[PDB]
């Protein structure tokens, strides 16, 4: 029953997966497919079923409920909140929930604004008048913010670029596994280096919590925490900033509307999340029992991917779904997930995106793409919507 090989779909599917998902949705909610790595997974498509499944407790995130074995490098890192169910998820999330409320994140606005102002200064100083938004803004800003929060020294941040690149588009399945092993070894060394140093960063606080009471946070969960907060704190926000400006720049009429009325900025970032959000499919879910989806039963322990990208093109929920419309009703989009695993970072992601978008539009007079929208290259990863590069001009 694998009705679709995702590996045999080419850059056409990478750049525009939506017709493929829409044809699946017309048949039903759940479809067995083959990942590019040859693994069999289920896709859940359509807004209503995707939203329901994201929050449905019958779909676990704990790999003890998955029949697909974890690799050695993955098993070193899986004791994290996103790959946990209650009660473990509940305890782990409580440890950092307070750090990421909208009120605490707003205390970061001065620093974020200062980072954005600096990065945009560097861009506008270009010897030509052109730049890659990927290298000039979308990559440096989130990695800088999350590194300062988790106390990652500046010389160490370069390796995160390489590791993330190996996670998104590895040369072979081994290079991603190798990147995970190096990242885990580094994080374990970083964790130990905070001991006794009285750091005020979030990682140092977590290390102390674990050292004080292994029943509140084990050493395995401490490494899982650092990992999850750094990876999820990074590559999704990079692509929100890139995908979001690609959306504005590829729709010059909406770029003009927003530039003419910055009070639309908040809705525009929400439509940015709706229209081309960085998460194409949610992270792995495993039914704890066979689950019947309108006649399609998924066996217990199979892998289930909720295709957020298709949910956001469901016309019943988002009329004229293929139109990027910054004044559209975006209520209930799933770009941050839904349920107990809803993104803990959403206020910080939104803060970074809003400041970055505003700064580009207020300070780059005639901002425009440097290539045509169809010339842009997208990474083939079915989990992520990401641009290889974003050439711009002003
Ligand atoms: C600003 C930096 C961010 C940090 C630190 C962060 C952190 C996290 C963490 C720790 C989780 C797991 C929560 C749990 O399991 O209870 C999570 C979930 C999630 N985040 Fe974020 N996040 C960030 C930004 C983003 C962005 C920009 C997006 C995409 C628009 C995003 C999308 C998601 C989604 C979809 C999930 C749920 C995955 C699923 O249910 O399988 N996050 N995030
Ligand atoms: C929260 C939405 C983003 O997901 C993540 O960043 C989470 C925290 C994450 O780090 C994992 C889900 C990674 O996914 C894969 O990592 C591979 C190296 C191993 C793989 N295996 C178990 C099948 C799986 O865990 C993440 C590094 C994946 C890449 C593509 C990514 O950046 C995804 C981001 C969002 C889905």
Numbering used by the authors: 12 to 405
Show sentences the authors wrote.
Cytochrome P450 PikC (CYP107L1) from Streptomyces venezuelae ATCC 15439 is an intriguing P450 monooxygenase with unusual innate substrate flexibility. In the biosynthetic pathway of methymycin/neomethymycin (1/2) and pikromycin (3, the first discovered natural ketolide), the sole P450 enzyme recognizes both 12-membered ring macrolide YC-17 (4) and 14-membered ring macrolide narbomycin as substrates. To date, it has been well known that the presence of the positively charged dialkylamino group as a substrate anchor is a prerequisite for PikC’s substrate recognition and catalytic activities. Based on a semi-rationally designed substrate binding strategy, non-canonical amino acid mutagenesis at the His238 position enables the unnatural activities of several PikC mutants towards the macrolactone precursors without any sugar appendix.
PikCH238pAcF also exhibited higher hydroxylation activity towards the 14-membered ring macrolide 5 than PikCWT. The affinity of PikCH238pAcF to 5 also increased by 3.3-fold (KD = 87.1 µM). In the complex structure, clear electron density corresponding to the structure of 5 was unambiguously observed at the active site. The H238pAcF mutation pushes away the desosamine for about 60 degrees in the structure of 5-bound PikCH238pAcF. This substrate repositioning abolishes the salt bridge between desosamine and Glu94 as observed in the PikCWT/5 complex, and rebuilds a salt bridge between desosamine and Glu85. Due to the relative position change, 5 loses several hydrophobic contacts with Leu88 and Gln89. Nevertheless, there in PikCH238pAcF/5 exists an extra hydrophobic contact between the desosamine moiety and Tyr295. Importantly, in the PikCH238pAcF structure in complex with 5, pAcF238 introduces more hydrophobic interactions through the methyl group of this ncAA with the C5’ methyl group of the desosamine moiety and the C6 methyl group of the macrolactone ring. Moreover, three water molecules were found to mediate a hydrogen bond network between the pAcF carbonyl, Glu94 carboxyl and C3’ hydroxyl group of desosamine in the co-crystal structure. Therefore, the hydrophobic interactions mediated by pAcF238, Tyr295 and the water-mediated hydrogen bond network likely make the main contribution to the increased binding affinity of PikCH238pAcF towards 5.
